[PDB]
Scaffold this active site. Structure first.
Site, PDB file in Angstrom:
ATOM      1  N   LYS A 195     -10.401  -8.643  38.328  1.00 40.29           N
ATOM      2  CA  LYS A 195     -10.890  -7.346  38.771  1.00 40.29           C
ATOM      3  C   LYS A 195     -11.232  -7.356  40.257  1.00 40.29           C
ATOM      4  O   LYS A 195     -11.328  -6.287  40.867  1.00 40.29           O
ATOM      5  CB  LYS A 195     -12.081  -6.923  37.927  1.00 40.29           C
ATOM      6  CG  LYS A 195     -12.557  -5.515  38.193  1.00 40.29           C
ATOM      7  CD  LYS A 195     -13.797  -5.481  39.034  1.00 40.29           C
ATOM      8  CE  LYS A 195     -14.306  -4.070  39.251  1.00 40.29           C
ATOM      9  NZ  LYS A 195     -14.772  -3.444  37.980  1.00 40.29           N
ATOM     10  N   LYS A 215     -29.611  -8.717  13.748  1.00 41.14           N
ATOM     11  CA  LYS A 215     -30.136  -9.339  12.537  1.00 41.14           C
ATOM     12  C   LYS A 215     -30.269  -8.362  11.375  1.00 41.14           C
ATOM     13  O   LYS A 215     -30.941  -8.680  10.390  1.00 41.14           O
ATOM     14  CB  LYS A 215     -31.500  -9.973  12.814  1.00 41.14           C
ATOM     15  CG  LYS A 215     -31.501 -11.073  13.857  1.00 41.14           C
ATOM     16  CD  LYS A 215     -30.835 -12.330  13.349  1.00 41.14           C
ATOM     17  CE  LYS A 215     -30.861 -13.414  14.395  1.00 41.14           C
ATOM     18  NZ  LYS A 215     -32.234 -13.908  14.658  1.00 41.14           N
ATOM     19  N   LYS A 261     -14.069  -8.868  30.721  1.00 39.40           N
ATOM     20  CA  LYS A 261     -14.799  -9.037  29.470  1.00 39.40           C
ATOM     21  C   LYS A 261     -14.830  -7.762  28.637  1.00 39.40           C
ATOM     22  O   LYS A 261     -14.620  -7.808  27.420  1.00 39.40           O
ATOM     23  CB  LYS A 261     -16.195  -9.529  29.799  1.00 39.40           C
ATOM     24  CG  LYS A 261     -16.176 -10.946  30.346  1.00 39.40           C
ATOM     25  CD  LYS A 261     -17.391 -11.362  31.149  1.00 39.40           C
ATOM     26  CE  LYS A 261     -17.603 -10.579  32.449  1.00 39.40           C
ATOM     27  NZ  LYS A 261     -18.214  -9.234  32.367  1.00 39.40           N
ATOM     28  N   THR A 262     -15.089  -6.615  29.262  1.00 42.08           N
ATOM     29  CA  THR A 262     -15.093  -5.367  28.507  1.00 42.08           C
ATOM     30  C   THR A 262     -13.702  -5.031  27.997  1.00 42.08           C
ATOM     31  O   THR A 262     -13.539  -4.546  26.869  1.00 42.08           O
ATOM     32  CB  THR A 262     -15.605  -4.227  29.375  1.00 42.08           C
ATOM     33  OG1 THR A 262     -14.721  -4.052  30.486  1.00 42.08           O
ATOM     34  CG2 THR A 262     -16.999  -4.503  29.867  1.00 42.08           C
ATOM     35  N   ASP A 288     -21.490  -3.298  26.223  1.00 47.30           N
ATOM     36  CA  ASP A 288     -20.907  -3.673  27.496  1.00 47.30           C
ATOM     37  C   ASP A 288     -22.017  -3.995  28.478  1.00 47.30           C
ATOM     38  O   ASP A 288     -23.023  -3.283  28.538  1.00 47.30           O
ATOM     39  CB  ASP A 288     -20.039  -2.551  28.058  1.00 47.30           C
ATOM     40  CG  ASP A 288     -18.787  -2.323  27.248  1.00 47.30           C
ATOM     41  OD1 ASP A 288     -18.280  -3.291  26.645  1.00 47.30           O
ATOM     42  OD2 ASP A 288     -18.304  -1.173  27.219  1.00 47.30           O
ATOM     43  N   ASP A 289     -21.811  -5.056  29.255  1.00 43.79           N
ATOM     44  CA  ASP A 289     -22.669  -5.417  30.378  1.00 43.79           C
ATOM     45  C   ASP A 289     -24.142  -5.444  29.970  1.00 43.79           C
ATOM     46  O   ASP A 289     -24.970  -4.668  30.451  1.00 43.79           O
ATOM     47  CB  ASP A 289     -22.427  -4.467  31.548  1.00 43.79           C
ATOM     48  CG  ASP A 289     -21.032  -4.603  32.124  1.00 43.79           C
ATOM     49  OD1 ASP A 289     -20.453  -5.705  32.038  1.00 43.79           O
ATOM     50  OD2 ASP A 289     -20.511  -3.604  32.660  1.00 43.79           O
TER      51      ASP A 289
HETATM   52  N1  ATP Z   1     -32.137 -21.670  -0.865  1.00 46.05           N
HETATM   53  C1  ATP Z   1     -31.999 -20.887   0.206  1.00 46.05           C
HETATM   54  N2  ATP Z   1     -32.873 -21.044   1.207  1.00 46.05           N
HETATM   55  C2  ATP Z   1     -32.797 -20.304   2.311  1.00 46.05           C
HETATM   56  N3  ATP Z   1     -31.853 -19.366   2.496  1.00 46.05           N
HETATM   57  C3  ATP Z   1     -30.910 -19.103   1.578  1.00 46.05           C
HETATM   58  C4  ATP Z   1     -30.934 -19.870   0.333  1.00 46.05           C
HETATM   59  N4  ATP Z   1     -29.905 -19.427  -0.400  1.00 46.05           N
HETATM   60  C5  ATP Z   1     -29.285 -18.460   0.319  1.00 46.05           C
HETATM   61  N5  ATP Z   1     -29.916 -18.235   1.479  1.00 46.05           N
HETATM   62  C6  ATP Z   1     -29.455 -17.289   2.521  1.00 46.05           C
HETATM   63  O1  ATP Z   1     -30.424 -17.042   3.534  1.00 46.05           O
HETATM   64  C7  ATP Z   1     -30.107 -15.779   4.111  1.00 46.05           C
HETATM   65  C8  ATP Z   1     -31.349 -15.169   4.724  1.00 46.05           C
HETATM   66  O2  ATP Z   1     -31.793 -15.938   5.825  1.00 46.05           O
HETATM   67  P1  ATP Z   1     -32.640 -15.197   6.960  1.00 46.05           P
HETATM   68  O3  ATP Z   1     -31.893 -13.975   7.428  1.00 46.05           O
HETATM   69  O4  ATP Z   1     -34.026 -15.100   6.381  1.00 46.05           O
HETATM   70  O5  ATP Z   1     -32.724 -16.267   8.145  1.00 46.05           O
HETATM   71  P2  ATP Z   1     -33.280 -15.709   9.538  1.00 46.05           P
HETATM   72  O6  ATP Z   1     -34.775 -15.571   9.412  1.00 46.05           O
HETATM   73  O7  ATP Z   1     -32.452 -14.521   9.952  1.00 46.05           O
HETATM   74  O8  ATP Z   1     -32.991 -16.894  10.568  1.00 46.05           O
HETATM   75  P3  ATP Z   1     -33.315 -16.580  12.105  1.00 46.05           P
HETATM   76  O9  ATP Z   1     -34.768 -16.179  12.064  1.00 46.05           O
HETATM   77  O10 ATP Z   1     -33.030 -17.886  12.794  1.00 46.05           O
HETATM   78  O11 ATP Z   1     -32.366 -15.464  12.464  1.00 46.05           O
HETATM   79  C9  ATP Z   1     -29.555 -14.929   2.983  1.00 46.05           C
HETATM   80  O12 ATP Z   1     -28.537 -14.062   3.497  1.00 46.05           O
HETATM   81  C10 ATP Z   1     -29.065 -15.939   1.954  1.00 46.05           C
HETATM   82  O13 ATP Z   1     -27.662 -15.894   1.702  1.00 46.05           O
HETATM   83  N1  ATP Z   2      -6.769 -10.578  30.142  1.00 47.12           N
HETATM   84  C1  ATP Z   2      -6.500  -9.733  31.157  1.00 47.12           C
HETATM   85  N2  ATP Z   2      -5.363  -9.828  31.860  1.00 47.12           N
HETATM   86  C2  ATP Z   2      -5.057  -9.007  32.881  1.00 47.12           C
HETATM   87  N3  ATP Z   2      -5.848  -8.013  33.277  1.00 47.12           N
HETATM   88  C3  ATP Z   2      -7.026  -7.822  32.672  1.00 47.12           C
HETATM   89  C4  ATP Z   2      -7.432  -8.666  31.547  1.00 47.12           C
HETATM   90  N4  ATP Z   2      -8.632  -8.224  31.146  1.00 47.12           N
HETATM   91  C5  ATP Z   2      -8.939  -7.173  31.946  1.00 47.12           C
HETATM   92  N5  ATP Z   2      -7.969  -6.930  32.815  1.00 47.12           N
HETATM   93  C6  ATP Z   2      -8.064  -5.902  33.842  1.00 47.12           C
HETATM   94  O1  ATP Z   2      -9.414  -5.631  34.194  1.00 47.12           O
HETATM   95  C7  ATP Z   2      -9.498  -4.251  34.527  1.00 47.12           C
HETATM   96  C8  ATP Z   2     -10.855  -3.703  34.135  1.00 47.12           C
HETATM   97  O2  ATP Z   2     -11.872  -4.564  34.598  1.00 47.12           O
HETATM   98  P1  ATP Z   2     -13.256  -4.553  33.797  1.00 47.12           P
HETATM   99  O3  ATP Z   2     -13.824  -3.155  33.816  1.00 47.12           O
HETATM  100  O4  ATP Z   2     -13.112  -5.307  32.506  1.00 47.12           O
HETATM  101  O5  ATP Z   2     -14.118  -5.492  34.759  1.00 47.12           O
HETATM  102  P2  ATP Z   2     -15.282  -6.351  34.082  1.00 47.12           P
HETATM  103  O6  ATP Z   2     -14.633  -7.517  33.382  1.00 47.12           O
HETATM  104  O7  ATP Z   2     -16.177  -5.417  33.311  1.00 47.12           O
HETATM  105  O8  ATP Z   2     -16.076  -6.897  35.361  1.00 47.12           O
HETATM  106  P3  ATP Z   2     -17.654  -6.644  35.468  1.00 47.12           P
HETATM  107  O9  ATP Z   2     -18.192  -7.379  34.269  1.00 47.12           O
HETATM  108  O10 ATP Z   2     -18.026  -7.256  36.793  1.00 47.12           O
HETATM  109  O11 ATP Z   2     -17.787  -5.142  35.421  1.00 47.12           O
HETATM  110  C9  ATP Z   2      -8.387  -3.549  33.773  1.00 47.12           C
HETATM  111  O12 ATP Z   2      -7.690  -2.593  34.543  1.00 47.12           O
HETATM  112  C10 ATP Z   2      -7.512  -4.657  33.242  1.00 47.12           C
HETATM  113  O13 ATP Z   2      -6.238  -4.736  33.891  1.00 47.12           O
END
Ligand code: ATP
Ligand code: ATP
Ligand code: ATP
Lengths: 450, 516, 17, 153, 153
Positions: free
Chosen positions: B486, B409, B327-328, B381-382
């Protein structure tokens, strides 16, 4: 005196430098008892000296001696009438009350932010010499400035004046020229640069452009419910302006998440045309221990009470008090303070409104906050394709053929989403190609719906 | 007669910042360079302040030295930081007042028509912090601050001063000192754009070019293209190191060629690290099948979704799965292949043995640094470790969680953009804990499901060969496998350290452990 | 820390013959 | 003594100002001792000059400890029956245990926020000159004003 | 200078014990502009002097004034060209990028356990003093010592 200048390292001379003040007037009082010419004093930033004598928490200073001496010399055993001590501070509460009781300092008059009328005079003074010496153009009268200046205070009021005349001065001067060559031309008017530099000067109270983060994309009239919401807000806000005996009013804008409660909250704050607005939000206060968070909230409200009018927007209350659903943990102090402050009554007819927001009512109902809020509002997110695609038109993206293409699928079926999510959906779908865009959007829209 | 202050300045010493110098110039120096015939008709008080705030670098103190070296005022009384402070009381403040004394003397005896005095506070943030709550209720710095701001805009109505201040933390300074009249202009000089950078990298090179040095092959345009966010001074550091490399080159008529090419890898930058990836991707990436390409082209898709879009300045993505599944690494490869100037990692590795508050602060720092630049892809990460979660008992770090979530947010400043990434090994606790709602989407990274994938993974790696690989393929026929790679690699080497007799049987006996 | 340990000293020599 | 003016940088002078304060008094004690001048001193704001013998109030340099000289002059080996000192404070408990007892400071008593009766009497004193004048304080009803004004003092 | 020793509890002395390091060379700059001799400074343990400065809060600002001082000194308004400053420590991650940026501390270096090969030359040196005496020869071969000592410093 400039306040602390009196203090010196040597002992006994620190307060002797005070004694030197009144030892120039007591002689006159002695030899001419009544008929004397009013020796006076002007302190400045007096808080440093002359605070409460038990200030040894952190100070550990001899300034006790200083305040004891001055507190003694003014009233004293000897009576000296011809002394005027003028003292000024931004933090008055630190003072020792004993010097502040009447007889030493009786008039404790405190200045207030200039009102929308008085700032006319404030601006009129600094424009008087201009418009007497035929500089300023006639098209800009000062009312147009005053009504636009919401919370400008004093120096913040004259700052735009000085800067605008400075801009008009700058235009004549002109980069890599060996000399900056001021073409000596008398014609300097300062026509609209005041109206420009209202952009440049933020005051403390409200910043008209600090709403961009919250309202990034403005307001879209997807349906009738949002019109209903804003209507309720405006007719609820005329209450405070045109009423008495409801000086605080308290509302909540709740609803499902990703529905944009905060945005239309701030739109209400705008359209209310109040002088003083704030958005008390966690986005500024992060990693703050509970005490600092609460004291910030109290700074917000002690700033608001100064004003004749105020609105505050509490944003994502659940995060403000750090609510977590599992192993419920919640800032006790923040909850208690936030709750008290809803039902705190401002002292003298000051009018305040609170606009709370959250995604969930249940936790507040369990925390006994909903009835603390006076009257609440729901925000129904888009429950219908016939509203969805109307909002999509008001945006403009997914043009007519794509509109028709999704119309069959969503015209007769449910769609329950918020527009915060909608924006992100359309932006993601738009990237790959026109042909693949609509089926991406729709499969995504059916993926999110659980 | 009257004497003009600047006299011979011609835009030398700096580059990169012309609009900013202009916005300082009109505010501060225009009233002072103008015929004073009508200035009293205009009734203007000459402004008494300038402030500079910004990151390390970006040329603020050079600006301040330029103004006062070039000018003919010839009266600069620089303060070096907390030099004010003294053990004995009253000296701390009076050390302030002996700055202003000369100017106040001149003004008293000589009046409105007078010369200039400049004071340059370097690192003002130490002596001047916000009165009222500081290292305790009272704090030590009330004295100096109340003296300073009683004096600048004081009872005396003094003009004939200019107070320049520099800092890195503009918020700590108090509004009483920052409001108009004492310090008007608070500039936001930050990392420059390529056009400004070219000016910088031209003026630091012109002193080489005036003489025949730096053979014509070098083109500063390419350098400005491949040095997007060097934070200023690293440019002249690069040039100095290039001088040095040419210098120890011609040791038994030197020239600097491909200096950027040699220097760029060696010099760390405030923005991206050149390569700090090896810790996360040490062994590279082998695509075993289709899911790799799927997640990765989804990544680049979502990447260009930021640059080519408005009205969504950030998109946050969790890419999760079972443990030991890279994942990392996928996050790092997305970041690498995406060509982002501000790529940075927030690994709990760096922050260990920290109280949750300090953890919070070392996590907000990098997001602030991202808010500086235009683009970024930050990766957490993690997360289950970053915010500690233990299954036995429900205990976690509330503060870090809340900070992280509101930071997701957080709308950054106008123009700026983010590509926040996050990894988890477990998603169900987040569904409990509300984190997922914040994230835009989810990217599952399956374990190796089929031996048909596994075998091509092994041939891609290149350790085994056809003969034994036939045996392993035959054993895995038809069965399903649930294995993170891994863990696979570990099993590989734990096999290879046995002799060829029981090599494969040790491998497979360990393999059948997992079995799911 | 125990900050704000600011302290003051006094003349006691007063050198004179 | 208008608060501390005895303190001075040169050590010994702060301690020795008091002998000058008491000198004429002890002179009249020794010479012409039987019927005496009965000199008085006011010694306002003891909260500045006296402390808990230097132990409290942070690290108060020994300049602060002039209390020792004062003690020794008022009730030390040489004694005085011809002079009385007065004290005036807003924070008595900050004073050391030593002085407040008999022989040094015989009588201690607060001056309390007066009752309605005393508030009437004091208001009467201030208004009396004007009331005496024919044209002042019409319909003032100081007793009504007293019952109105609750804690003013 | 050892970091832990210049920090005095009494405010001002801690930061003002640093400017002395630079003052003599500054005076040399006043006298001789560009042709002065170097003045080398050695901070033996810097991570106690310098740590990451607090941000956005009044709290967590302890012991930052020292950093705000020396950062102002080494590259300030008085552009000071004649000094090269050394720093040396064992915790390179505690320290500001504000300090590590070019102009203040250009280059960072790593020096770690040398290797058997490095030890060999160390032993050549400290043996070579005895070689100069010539007394210390017992057919003692240095490779025994190298290959025996693996982690030694
Ligand atoms: N009529 C409208 N009513 C509500 N939101 C709108 C409207 N028009 C645009 N927006 C958009 O709403 C966004 C803001 O929403 P807001 O960030 O308040 O939601 P939130 O509180 O983050 O939701 P949550 O709490 O689930 O994360 C703005 O970026 C804007 O583009
Ligand atoms: N898509 C992929 N294909 C082949 N090898 C991969 C891929 N993604 C990661 N690797 C291998 O994973 C190794 C590193 O592992 P990594 O540190 O990501 O473990 P991790 O996913 O973080 O596990 P954990 O979350 O348990 O720590 C690298 O040396 C890389 O070769
Ligand atoms: N315009 C510029 N572009 C790039 N580098 C610059 C520029 N101006 C100055 N420099 C470099 O900046 C250095 C001094 O200014 P500097 O940017 O270090 O101040 P500062 O970084 O704000 O202060 P601090 O280091 O405390 O943050 C000089 O050594 C010079 O090489």
């Amino acid at each position: 005196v400039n306040g602390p200048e009196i203090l010196n390292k040597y002992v006994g001379e620190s307060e002797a430098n005070i004694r030197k003040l009144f030892a120039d007037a007591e002689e006159e009082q002695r030899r001419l008892g009544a008929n004397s010419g009013l020796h006076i004093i002007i302190f400045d930033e007096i808080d440093a000296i002359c605070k409460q004598r038990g200030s040894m928490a952190g100070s550990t200073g001899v300034h006790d001696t200083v305040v004891n001496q001055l507190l003694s010399k003014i009233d004293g055993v000897e009576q000296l009438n011809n002394i005027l001590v003028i003292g000024m501070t931004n933090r008055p509460d630190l003072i020792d009350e004993a010097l502040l009781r009447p007889g030493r300092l009786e008039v404790k008059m405190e200045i207030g932010l200039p009102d929308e009328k008085g700032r006319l005079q404030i601006l009129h003074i600094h424009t008087a010499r201009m418009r007497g010496h035929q500089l300023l153009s006639a098209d800009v009268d000062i009312k147009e400035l005053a009504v636009e200046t919401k919370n400008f205070s004093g120096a913040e009021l004259e700052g735009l004046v000085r800067a605008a005349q400075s801009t008009a001065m700058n235009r004549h001067i002109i980069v890599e020229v060996d000399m900056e060559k001021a073409e000596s031309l008398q014609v300097t008017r300062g026509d609209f640069l005041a109206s420009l530099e209202n952009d440049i000067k933020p005051a403390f109270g409200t910043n008209q452009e600090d709403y961009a983060s919250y309202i990034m994309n403005g307001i879209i009239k997807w349906g009738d419910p949002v019109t209903r919401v804003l209507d309720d807000g405006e007719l609820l806000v005329q209450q405070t302006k045109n009423s008495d005996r409801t000086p605080l009013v308290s509302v909540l804008l709740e609803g499902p998440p990703h529905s944009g409660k905060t945005a239309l909250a701030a739109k209400i704050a705008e359209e209310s045309n109040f002088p003083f607005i704030k958005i008390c939000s966690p986005d500024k206060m992060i990693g703050f221990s509970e005490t600092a968070k609460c004291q910030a909230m109290k700074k917000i409200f002690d700033d608001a009470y100064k004003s004749q009018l105020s609105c505050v927007v509490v944003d994502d209350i659940e995060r403000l008090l750090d609510y977590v659903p599992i192993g419920p943990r919640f800032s006790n102090l923040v909850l208690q303070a936030l709750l008290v402050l809803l039902k705190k009554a401002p002292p003298q007819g000051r009018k305040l409104l609170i606009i709370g927001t959250t995604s969930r009512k249940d936790v507040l109902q369990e925390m006994e906050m909903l009835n603390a809020f006076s009257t609440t509002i729901h925000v129904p997110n888009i429950a219908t394709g016939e509203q969805l695609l109307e909002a999509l038109e008001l945006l403009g993206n997914f043009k007519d053929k794509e509109r028709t293409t999704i119309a069959q699928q969503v015209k007769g079926k449910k769609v329950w989403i918020g527009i915060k999510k909608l924006l992100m959906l359309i932006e993601m779908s738009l990237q790959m190609d026109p042909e693949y865009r609509v089926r991406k959007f729709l499969a995504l829209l059916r993926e999110e719906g659980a | 007669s009257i004497i003009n202050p600047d006299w011979n300045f011609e835009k030398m010493g700096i580059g990169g910042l012309d609009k900013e110098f202009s916005d300082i110039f009109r505010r501060a120096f225009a009233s002072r360079v103008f015929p004073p015939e009508i200035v009293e008709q205009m009734g203007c008080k000459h402004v008494k302040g300038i402030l500079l705030y910004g990151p390390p670098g970006c040329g603020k103190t050079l600006l301040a030295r330029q103004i006062g070296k070039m000018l003919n005022a010839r009266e600069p009384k620089v303060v070096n930081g907390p030099e004010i402070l003294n053990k004995y009381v009253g000296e701390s403040e009076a050390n302030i007042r002996k700055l202003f004394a000369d100017a106040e003397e001149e003004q008293r005896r000589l009046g409105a028509n007078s010369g200039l005095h400049i004071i340059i506070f370097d690192e003002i943030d130490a002596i001047c912090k916000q009165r009222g709550s500081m290292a305790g209720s009272t704090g030590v710095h009330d004295t100096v601050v109340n003296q300073l701001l009683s004096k600048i805009d004081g009872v005396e109505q003094l003009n004939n001063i200019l107070v320049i201040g520099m800092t890195n933390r503009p918020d700590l300074i108090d509004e009483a000192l920052l409001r108009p009249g004492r310090l008007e202009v608070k500039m936001e000089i930050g990392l420059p754009d390529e056009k400004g950078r070219l000016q910088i990298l031209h003026i630091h090179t012109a002193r080489m070019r005036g003489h025949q040095l730096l053979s014509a092959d070098v083109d500063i345009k390419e350098l400005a293209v491949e040095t997007k966010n060097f934070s200023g001074a690293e440019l002249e550091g690069l040039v100095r190191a290039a001088q040095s490399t040419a210098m120890n080159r011609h040791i038994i008529v030197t020239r600097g060629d491909f200096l950027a090419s040699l220097e760029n890898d060696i010099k760390p930058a405030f923005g991206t690290n050149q390569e700090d990836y090896a810790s996360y991707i040490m062994n590279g990436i082998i695509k075993w099948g289709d899911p790799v390409t799927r997640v990765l082209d989804d990544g680049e898709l979502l990447v260009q979704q930021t640059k080519n879009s408005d009205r969504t300045p950030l998109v946050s993505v969790l890419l999760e799965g079972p443990p030991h599944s890279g994942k990392t690494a996928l996050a790092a490869k997305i970041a690498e292949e995406s060509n982002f100037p501000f790529i940075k990692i927030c690994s709990p590795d760096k922050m260990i043995g920290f109280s949750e508050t300090a953890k919070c602060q070392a996590m907000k720092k990098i997001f602030d640094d991202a808010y500086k630049s235009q683009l970024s892809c930050v990766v957490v990460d993690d997360i289950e470790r970053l915010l500690d979660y233990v299954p036995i008992g429900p205990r976690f770090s509330n503060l870090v969680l809340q900070a992280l979530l509101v930071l997701l947010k957080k709308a950054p400043p106008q123009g700026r953009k983010l590509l926040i990434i996050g990894t988890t090994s477990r998603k169900d606790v987040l569904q409990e804990m509300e984190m997922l709602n914040a994230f835009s989407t989810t990217i599952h990274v399956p374990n190796i499901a089929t031996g048909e994938q596994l075998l091509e993974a092994l041939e891609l790696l290149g350790n085994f060969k056809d003969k034994e690989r036939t045996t392993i393929a035959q054993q895995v026929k038809g069965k399903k496998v649930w294995i993170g790679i891994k863990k696979l690699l570990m099993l590989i080497e734990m096999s290879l350290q046995m002799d060829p007799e029981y090599r494969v049987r040790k491998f497979l006996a360990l393999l059948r452990e997992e079995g799911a | 820390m125990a900050e704000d340990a600011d302290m003051r000293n006094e003349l006691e020599e007063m050198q004179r013959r």
